[PDB]
Design a protein around this nucleic acid. Sequence first.
RNA 1: UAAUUGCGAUAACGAACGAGACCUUAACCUACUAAAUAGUGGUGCUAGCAUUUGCUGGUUAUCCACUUCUUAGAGGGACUAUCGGUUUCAAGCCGAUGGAAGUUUGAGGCAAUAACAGGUCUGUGAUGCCCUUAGACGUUCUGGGCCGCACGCGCGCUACACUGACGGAGCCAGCGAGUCUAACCUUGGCCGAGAGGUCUUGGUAAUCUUGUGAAACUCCGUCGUGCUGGGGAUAGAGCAUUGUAAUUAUUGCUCUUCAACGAGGAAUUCCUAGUAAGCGCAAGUCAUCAGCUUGCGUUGAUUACGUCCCUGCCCUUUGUACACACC
Lengths: 206, 60, 70, 55, 143, 145, 67, 80, 63, 141
Amino acid sequence: FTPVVLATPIPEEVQQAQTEIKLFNKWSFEEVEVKDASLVDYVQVRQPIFVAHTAGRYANKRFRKAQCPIIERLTNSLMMNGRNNGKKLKAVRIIKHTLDIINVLTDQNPIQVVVDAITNTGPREDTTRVGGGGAARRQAVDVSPLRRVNQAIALLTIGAREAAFRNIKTIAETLAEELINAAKGSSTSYAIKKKDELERVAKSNR
Amino acid sequence: VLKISTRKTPNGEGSKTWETYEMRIHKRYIDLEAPVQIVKRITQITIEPGVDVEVVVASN
Amino acid sequence: AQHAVILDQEKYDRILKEVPTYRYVSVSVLVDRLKIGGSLARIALRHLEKEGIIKPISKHSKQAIYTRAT
Amino acid sequence: GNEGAIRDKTAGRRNNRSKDVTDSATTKKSNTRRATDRHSRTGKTDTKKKVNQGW
Amino acid sequence: PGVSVRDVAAQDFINAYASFLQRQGKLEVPGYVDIVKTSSGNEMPPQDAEGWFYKRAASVARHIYMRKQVGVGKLNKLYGGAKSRGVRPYKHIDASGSINRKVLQALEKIGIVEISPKGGRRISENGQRDLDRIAAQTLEEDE
Amino acid sequence: SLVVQEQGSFQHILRLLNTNVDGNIKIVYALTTIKGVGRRYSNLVCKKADVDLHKRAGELTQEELERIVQIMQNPTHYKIPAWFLNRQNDITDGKDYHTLANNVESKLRDDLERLKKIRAHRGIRHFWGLRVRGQHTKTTGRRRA
Amino acid sequence: GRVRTKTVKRASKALIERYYPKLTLDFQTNKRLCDEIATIQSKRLRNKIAGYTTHLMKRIQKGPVRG
Amino acid sequence: GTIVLYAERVQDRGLSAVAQAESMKFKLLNGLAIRRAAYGVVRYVMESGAKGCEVVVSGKLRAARAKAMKFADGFLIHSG
Amino acid sequence: TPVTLAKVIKVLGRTGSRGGVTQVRVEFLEDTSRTIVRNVKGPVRENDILVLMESEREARRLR
Amino acid sequence: AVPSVQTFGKKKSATAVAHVKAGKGLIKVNGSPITLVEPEILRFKVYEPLLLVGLDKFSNIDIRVRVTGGGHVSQVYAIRQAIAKGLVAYHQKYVDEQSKNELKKAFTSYDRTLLIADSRRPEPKKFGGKGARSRFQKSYR
RNA sequence: UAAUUGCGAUAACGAACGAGACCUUAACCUACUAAAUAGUGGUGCUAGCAUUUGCUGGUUAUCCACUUCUUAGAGGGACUAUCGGUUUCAAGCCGAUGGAAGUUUGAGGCAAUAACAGGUCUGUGAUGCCCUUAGACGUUCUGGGCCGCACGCGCGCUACACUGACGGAGCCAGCGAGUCUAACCUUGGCCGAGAGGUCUUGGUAAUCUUGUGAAACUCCGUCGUGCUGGGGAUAGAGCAUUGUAAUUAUUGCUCUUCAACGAGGAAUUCCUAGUAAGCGCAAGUCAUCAGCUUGCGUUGAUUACGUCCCUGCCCUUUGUACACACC
Ligand SMILES: [Mg+2]
Ligand SMILES: [Mg+2]
Ligand SMILES: [Mg+2]
Ligand SMILES: [Mg+2]
Ligand SMILES: [Mg+2]
Ligand SMILES: [Mg+2]
Ligand SMILES: [Mg+2]
Ligand SMILES: [Mg+2]
Ligand SMILES: [Mg+2]
Ligand SMILES: [Mg+2]
Ligand SMILES: [Mg+2]
Ligand SMILES: [Mg+2]
Ligand SMILES: [Mg+2]
Ligand SMILES: [Mg+2]
Ligand SMILES: [Mg+2]
Ligand SMILES: [Mg+2]
Ligand SMILES: [Mg+2]
Ligand SMILES: [Mg+2]
Ligand SMILES: [Mg+2]
Ligand SMILES: [Mg+2]
């Protein structure tokens, strides 16, 4: 890659994959495509990032929250349940770890796996408590792609976090695990269940 | 800036409204080399109600 | 209390022959295979590295990770 | 004195705990009057001359 | 090329310096080690048991190298941590002036630090010497 | 550290100080189930006894165990400070003690009684089942007895 | 809501009324105009004014504006 | 000797609030109709060429229950 | 399973007494030239793509 | 006097001052090399400028930074801003315009506000809550 | 529209108070004036490592220069600008580009007319009237009490752990405050495990404490799901500090003792971006005592960018036998 050095030196694999490709912790942003139409737009990938940390003014306008890199939207949503409010660095590291884990199992761009599990847990339709007079039925609705992404990111991490609670297996594993079983849905995952059982009730009342 | 932060109320009733007065202290210093005459001249005059003037001496 | 705090010779031998096919090994993973608690499990992660089987691809505290040797 | 205190039965925790709690405990605000706020009790009244002299 | 200690990351250095003061034998280690606690804002003594006085000294050394002059009071405030007052909100608390002031004398009597003017202690000329040395040793394992 | 081995040499659970102790636990903490030996005390004692803390209660030679008990019930001899002790400056013979095991129960009694028997308000208050260290007794502590 | 108060619109009206030649589709010179040509006590109010006598001017050039 | 006092009349009392409060006090303390008192104060302040002026009188006057009047004229602003 | 893709072609308003729901007209991409109005759950702008899980059935008012 | 410039970077309260003189390509912060910095997870955040715009670029210059204020992260974003702002300052007075304006382009496109300082800042708290927006608790009755 | 904020309709035209303007603070100036009580580069004097120039430090003045950073004066800056969608092509609203900044730029200060038997006579040597006035309801001195404990309610703190506790190690803020006729803020040196003690010292302060080396946090180890090394109530014994006085335990330290609590029913609070939440700090109080408050900065999200369903309130319309106004 035509190596270059000056005074205080810059590491080999650092010099290397940096100036060449523009990739993640050390993972490919090329390839990596959203196998479900829609959800593109509402899932970033390219522009590429180094790590998922970004002072990104993503909230001052309604939809621009979509432009946040999906990987980092996935981390961002780890840093919650009070005790872990803030603590991005905490999350970021988990994610690094997670993707390493995911990659170990079944190869694949772990960042592409993350794509699949998200794509694969967004409820195509749901329900809402319409009135109809005191005794409320449940009107079926086709839900937004954005909500579908959001709800996916929430659903994913949560059921991981919950499983991760009170046992030896670490967050980063259960997170990976939840994603792995969700990249191609297996109904052994927290999210796929809730996804499917949200569309269950949705169907059941139309 | 000298803050003083107080409840408005003489007593205790009412939503707890708090209110902070403040006083701004501005201080300059101007270094001069002059003989005895101009000093005393320039110091007695230039007086001003509200400006506190302090003239010292020495290098220690 | 519920077992995995020692080494029972058969356990050691168990640990050598039972770690292929493990695409994943870590602290958790070792306790999971109905054996070794997080402490002596951690020791295994250094002494399986003594030579062979495990490749160190991830760094540190809490999270460990290896794969079968090549 | 203190000797009295320790010796005296009918005292200490064990005893109170075995007693039934009065209902005046779990009461209310009591309130008493407020609906009468705007109705002056003095029974007196001013008078349109005296206010006109003053004001 | 030339070398400082600023050219080496924290941990690799201080452990390399811990290993060195240990390997040495020359030190002066009070005696109440292992029986002492390093701060009132702590719960258990250090887990290095045999050692950690090196860990600190090495930590001490590097810090006083990094700057003009520091005292015992500064190291206390530096080295201290959070003390859970059990059920009552945490507050910062200073660490032990003994552990440090003895480490300061231990590194001084070994000539790695001297009682600076202005105040406190300043990195000895011979401290520089031996610090920048093992610093260079630390990058030589990386070569 | 090291993959170890051993034979049938270690037995699980092992009684000392008139109480019982689980083997398969790191010996430092194992000893704490004895009344009157917090983690700190445990820590210093084993450090004194020349025993490897990386070991469990499980291993630990019988001789090692014997030494460990020894120091515990004679702390001033085996150069343990004094401010490290649960009963400095008694209140009768003034010696410094580390009251251990089934005995700390005995001594809580002795003192408590001493107070009551002396009619001291502290005692009176102890006898009444209330809190003594001068806390508000209105809202807190309701379940209790 | 950036709805301009009366005084801003009041004054813009009057300025276009009697100084149409001089003024433009340019606030930046409309500004400088207001200094020389009008007395105001604050920068913000002058800008808030000039920006609107601008806008008013910018849509006179294509159709009249009532008032 | 280190301290020195001088008196000094003030350019128009009619534009000093504090000059006019103390006026009313002295108007009413000297037994004067209430409206008359303030309405004089307002009418002198105005004539002293102010842009506007306001006199509140709160409290209790000869009747038992308290009241409060406002006497204003001309121009005042109240904010900022 | 018949999956049906439709593109939002206008935003009509919020229904639902609550108001979390929005009325929108879409155009399916697998053969256009026909339109149906659906009810969303999450936030929507123009040019979005809804997964009509059942192709033909529409709502109007919501209480 | 060799060719040199001075620049800064600010995130929150952190301010990062950088001196970019001409030399043999050093890049040290406060007193240590840029390969340290740790945070570490965020290490690449500050490597970022050099990689965005070709590692070479730095061979004819020395680079130093010294951050005060801010916090363990506020400073990481500060120092990188100063680095890239400096690289573009230097090509403004010394190299030609088009190289400079080709550098702005590579930074602005990618970006994380490398040239442009983030405006955000703590809002004052007001009385009646532990936060600014946060209000205490009430109970009615 | 946040706004009787505007457009528009128009027997009204055109105005003022209030809103806005205004003011204060946080944002932007390699433009202006400067600074040994702020800091940068060069120079000597000098240390360490490399030596081939280099790298990293010491040196309140050994000198020269500068104002990017800090400070605060004077200016400038933004007007929702340009462009485009949308709309009675109106006030506007929405998107893109630019921009320090485009949610009233963010946050406060100020705030018309009126109402309340709101609260305060316990802040006032503000005050009417009533009461009391020497066995006093004046005042002061000694001691107790406001903390008293079957229980009901509210604001909080700490937790139930493995996004963790622990032990090393990294090491980063901002708003403040400090002693004269006095004992305030305290660096540094010793002594002590600790709390602390002792010797000195700088500061009436951008000059010294103090870079307030704050805490979450980051890193390497230990523990390994077990009421466990989570949790630290209750209690024993000892040591110190404030104070004339510490018992009903002011506070601080050490040892031991090791509770409830395994995420909390009906219910219900707060909140839209550097916000929420996590986190510590300074100031008030203060001899001694913060689990309170007022501010401060550190880390930093998820979810709306809507509606009238609940609740609250405003506006019309309408009824009134009320106007002391549905108490
Ligand atoms: Mg906490
Ligand atoms: Mg620490
Ligand atoms: Mg610290
Ligand atoms: Mg015990
Ligand atoms: Mg006005
Ligand atoms: Mg206003
Ligand atoms: Mg400047
Ligand atoms: Mg932009
Ligand atoms: Mg009343
Ligand atoms: Mg009063
Ligand atoms: Mg009380
Ligand atoms: Mg309250
Ligand atoms: Mg820690
Ligand atoms: Mg002693
Ligand atoms: Mg002095
Ligand atoms: Mg426990
Ligand atoms: Mg604990
Ligand atoms: Mg205080
Ligand atoms: Mg209070
Ligand atoms: Mg009527």
